[PDB]
């Protein structure tokens, strides 16, 4: 090759690596962070970000009288001088003492001893994770950061000989570091838990630190939040000595009537991560924090004074960090404290920084959340970003209250205030400022999230769960209310969101129906707890090993598996494999028998029903395994054991097909000689009842403590039926013309030995329980003599079920076309006093996808883990479900 073409490839490699390194630099310094979730509790009844949006958009003024349950001497501490205050109303969280101690594992002792800042912050973080489409329980072990802007407002009062009740927990319950630490401890997060003390700027500084941590790869996701609560009214008294609080309590932000600043409570948290990570993981992006900046003023006229130069510098630094021109943003969530000193300085800083070269028809629209709820304090910036996020989402800037006129202290003649709401070529961008009293100015820039199907599975279960039944009812009511205000949501998307993006709690319920006319009433009946046809409820077991159960005959009905053959492709594939295995050892096809094709034999014949039952059971068990329910044990019943022997891995498909087909064919001559009769009695009573007939009859199967099947000759069977009718015993004759598990099979014994010849047994992968021996059996021992004994010796289903329950097994999934042994299994379970729950797959005249999903939902409600991804899908459109319905209780410290 020439030298030129040789060096060309090296140049190409070099420039590609150069581009890769430059892109690495760009994503390592100027990476856009994605706000994937948020959660706020602010005064005025606001509990969700949507509550905040409807509050601020409506122009509601969320300032009301002081709380009366906090022990304050509210009638006495009002004086419009020495140690009193001249304000009688501010933004308060009257439910600040309300907290769900049990949900997070916290004790009432620790809860009352714990700062309400931590109590609010835990719930806010949990809701923020839930609103991001993330399951908080699945966040355990992840490198998730926690950055909280909080402060020691004083709830236990360490300087005052902390009370006897909160003794021992006044460090853990009140250190400001533990406010961030407890989130990670409860949620199991691994990223750093750092709390920031910066007075009225801590939350936005925490967002800055979270952004820097995520950009450096120290975290995968992060919690950037703030909290403010007022255990004592000192913040009003200390700031009343200087005329800093407004006389009426309204934060007249940037208004000519600006005369002070009223404080307020509130918690506000964001769950954020890298934008590329959000796109890769398929999380919904609410907004994009492009850049951030923080600095100081230092040379301010007094320590607690502002500085226009510092505010301009941080604004310009934030703009440069995001790589955005000042004219790019068309809105600012100014601090807007309302002070006479602070407002003109902030307005001058905004005018100098942002509005200097903007077009003559797009002024910068300035507003403040403080006019609505008052000064939140630490949680001010992280609430302002929520306000701007929802303003971008709804495409309208809400009005800022109490602006009778723009303040005359600044020359507006570029920038205009949001006196009334205003509506909105290029992405929407907005700034937020969190200037503090300690001089730490902060500023962030947010941008509109960038613009981002599968067929609907029928009868998609809707899953609900909660820690307690009352919480479950609250969850159902909340979901019903949410679905009422929605124009025709997609039910499969709701099913996916409920199954995947919400924790499975203890008390569970499910709604399985294929029509969008019963789900509403079912949700209601769940809400008031009434029963419903398409509703299932239960208490999931913490631990327990799973069992597959394979009964013998009886679980047959025409058309079984017909609907599943069309609807379910996995079941069709398994039936096809069974048919291919069976073809060589029989003179017809399984699919024709199941589909009821013309001329195919019916289920009356013994030789065709048993292979059909085997194939259906094996296919159903494999479908269960495909849905993620891998058995911990398998048990059978007569011919069903062969199917169990296939699922355990001891017998290949060909060997099991050979055994079942040849065994049934060798059982054909027994037809008409005798039959079975099921009578409900103990084993000893049946045994001593069959004594006069001697060898004619025998105990065919001990299904349960009060359910035994006896097999024998037709004449003796009728004689015993008449005797039971005389004795008033509920004896039922099974529809079978052949007396299996009786002496008659000896007549065909050698032929049975021919049925199992040539097989290749293997050790069991899954522990198989032989109903003949009554305990686990090695897989290699399944020889011809074993199968002959299975056909001949009495089944001991009750004994092996008792032994299996003794081994910690707690779930019994019948893989039949219709439950036949569920009664006996439940009888044994209640006899031994265990908490095991029995389930079935299909039911008579019910074999479509709806019944399959009903069985799966019942199993999940009983506590069996189910891979809902396979049932529903890998990824559907995101759906915003309501957060957890906490059952709160009052927790406050008394003097």
């Amino acid at each position: 090759v020439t030298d030129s073409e040789k060096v060309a490839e090296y140049l190409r490699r070099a420039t590609l690596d150069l581009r890769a390194a430059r892109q690495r630099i760009r994503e390592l310094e100027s990476e856009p962070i994605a706000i994937i979730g948020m959660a706020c509790r602010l005064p005025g009844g606001v509990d969700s970000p949507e509550g905040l949006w409807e509050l601020v958009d409506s122009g509601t003024d969320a300032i009301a009288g002081f709380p009366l349950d906090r022990g304050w001497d509210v009638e006495g501490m009002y004086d419009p001088a020495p140690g009193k205050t001249y304000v009688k109303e501010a933004g308060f969280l009257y439910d600040a003492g309300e907290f769900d101690a049990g949900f997070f594992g916290i004790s009432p002792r620790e809860a009352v001893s714990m700062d309400p800042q931590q109590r609010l912050m835990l719930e806010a973080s949990w809701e923020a994770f839930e609103r991001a489409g993330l399951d908080p329980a699945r966040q355990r072990g992840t490198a998730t950061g926690v950055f909280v802007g909080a402060t020691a407002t004083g709830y236990v009062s360490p300087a005052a000989e902390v009370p006897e009740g909160a003794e021992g927990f006044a460090i853990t319950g009140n250190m400001t570091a533990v406010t961030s630490g407890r989130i990670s401890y409860t949620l199991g997060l691994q990223g750093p838990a750092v709390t920031i003390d910066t007075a009225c700027s801590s939350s936005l500084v925490a967002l800055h630190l979270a952004c820097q941590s995520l950009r450096q790869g120290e975290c995968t996701t992060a919690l950037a939040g703030g909290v403010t609560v007022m255990p004592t009214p000192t913040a009003f008294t200390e700031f009343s000595r200087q005329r800093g609080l407004a006389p009426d309590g309204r934060c007249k932000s940037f208004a000519a009537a600006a005369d002070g600043t009223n404080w307020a409570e509130g918690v506000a948290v964001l769950v954020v991560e890298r934008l590329s990570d959000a796109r890769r993981n398929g999380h919904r992006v609410l907004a994009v924090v492009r850049g951030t900046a923080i600095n100081q003023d230092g040379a301010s006229n007094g320590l607690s004074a502002p500085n226009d130069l510092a505010q301009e510098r941080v604004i310009r630094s934030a703009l440069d960090n995001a790589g955005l021109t000042a004219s790019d943003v068309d809105a600012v969530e100014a601090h807007g404290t309302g002070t006479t000193l602070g407002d003109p300085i902030e307005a001058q800083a905004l005018l100098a920084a942002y509005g200097h070269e903007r077009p003559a028809h797009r002024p910068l629209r300035v507003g403040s959340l403080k006019s609505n709820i008052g000064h939140a304090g630490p949680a001010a910036g992280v609430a302002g970003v929520i306000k701007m996020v929802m303003a971008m989402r709804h495409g309208v800037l809400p009005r800022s209250l109490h602006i009778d006129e723009p303040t005359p202290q600044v020359d507006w003649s570029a920038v205009t205030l949001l006196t009334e709401p205003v509506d909105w070529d290029r992405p929407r961008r907005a700034g937020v400022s969190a200037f503090g009293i300690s001089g730490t100015n902060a500023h962030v820039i947010l941008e509109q999230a960038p613009t981002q199907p599968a067929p609907p599975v029928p009868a998609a279960p809707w899953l609900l769960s909660a820690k307690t039944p009352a919480a479950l009812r609250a969850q159902a009511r909340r979901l019903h209310t949410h679905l009422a205000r929605h124009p025709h949501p997609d039910p499969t998307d709701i099913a996916h969101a409920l199954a995947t993006t919400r924790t499975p709690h203890e008390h569970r319920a499910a709604l399985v129906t294929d029509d969008h006319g019963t789900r509403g009433p079912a949700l209601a009946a769940l809400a008031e707890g009434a029963p419903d046809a398409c509703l299932i409820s239960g208490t999931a077991l913490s631990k327990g090993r799973t069992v597959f159960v394979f009964p013998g005959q009886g679980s047959q009905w025409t058309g079984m598996g017909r609907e599943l053959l069309h609807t379910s492709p996995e079941f069709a594939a398994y039936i096809a494999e069974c048919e291919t295995a069976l073809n060589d050892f029989v003179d017809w096809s399984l699919t024709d028998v199941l589909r009821g094709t013309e001329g195919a034999p019916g289920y009356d014949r013994v030789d065709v029903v048993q292979p059909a039952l085997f194939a259906v059971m094996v296919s159903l068990a494999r479908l269960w395994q495909h849905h993620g329910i891998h058995p911990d044990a398998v048990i059978g019943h007569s011919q069903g054991e062969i199917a169990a022997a296939h699922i355990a891995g001891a017998l290949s498909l060909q060997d099991a097909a050979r055994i079942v087909a040849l065994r049934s064919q060798a059982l054909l001559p027994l037809a008409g000689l005798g039959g079975m009769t099921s009578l409900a009695l103990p084993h000893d009573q049946a045994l001593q009842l069959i004594q006069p007939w001697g060898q004619d009859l025998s105990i065919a199967s001990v299904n349960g403590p009060h359910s035994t099947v006896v097999s024998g000759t037709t004449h003796a069977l009728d004689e015993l039926h008449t005797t039971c009718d005389t004795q008033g015993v509920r004896a039922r004759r099974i529809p079978v013309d052949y007396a299996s598990h009786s002496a008659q099979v000896e007549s065909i014994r050698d032929t049975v030995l021919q049925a199992a010849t040539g097989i290749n047994p293997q050790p069991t992968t899954i522990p198989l329980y032989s109903t003949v021996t009554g305990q686990p059996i090695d897989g290699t021992q399944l020889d011809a003599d074993y199968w002959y004994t299975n056909l001949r010796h009495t089944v001991r289903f009750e004994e092996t079920t008792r032994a299996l329950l003794g081994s910690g097994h707690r779930h019994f999934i019948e893989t039949t076309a219709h439950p036949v042994l569920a009664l006996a299994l439940e009888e044994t379970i209640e006899a031994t006093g265990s908490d095991a729950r029995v389930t079935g797959t299909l039911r008579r005249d019910h074999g479509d996808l709806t019944q399959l999903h009903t069985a799966l939902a019942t199993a999940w409600t009983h506590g069996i883990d189910v891979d809902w991804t396979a049932v529903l899908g890998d990824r559907r459109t995101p759906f915003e479900l309501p957060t957890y319905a906490f059952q709160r209780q009052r927790y406050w410290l008394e003097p």
Partner: antibody
Amino acid sequence: EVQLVQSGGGLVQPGRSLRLSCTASGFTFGDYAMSWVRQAPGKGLEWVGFIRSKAYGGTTEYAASVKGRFTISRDDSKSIAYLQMNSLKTEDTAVYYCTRGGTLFDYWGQGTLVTVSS
Amino acid sequence: VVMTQSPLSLPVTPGEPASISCRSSQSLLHSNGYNYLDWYLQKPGQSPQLLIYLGSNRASGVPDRFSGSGSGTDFTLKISRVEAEDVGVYYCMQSLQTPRLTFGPGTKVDIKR
């Protein structure tokens, strides 16, 4: 993101033709010179051949042991490289690797195991 | 004709660095001041991948622990941190003379004990 996916292997008795396709997705296939490099079982890498880019002329060169028998072509419209192996010999059993760059093999395909014997 | 040779094998352990050296039979430093040499890695069961080109320039996506060095005839690939994922065959392969008949015997790298 650059991707090279090979196909067209399978058992072949000696002395017939075979085609190995290798599709490229994630870069400008036209500018790159494209190479095939085989590796017999247990032996080291052994370069087979390459083709220049269409801009350079599209000419082909091959290793000394594969004069005439082997051929290289490229569908630039759909961006696949084709190795036509005519008259396979019993010693051509190897794992043929598909690589970008004539002289510098920056990225390699998964490799197709072509086994030949009577 | 140019000939390149490296040690046949070099046992390594995770816990201490290593250096795979190799020497050419000719001065590979081209007139343009570049040693026309490359270093490739082939892991067991995976296709070969590039590590170094032109003696010292590392390829993007390669771990930073790898570093090529040397000039003229003598070259080395120094690995600061040895990991089980890095076990394989390392080929130092020239490009001054073309066409290249074969990569060469390479240098097997394996866990030392």
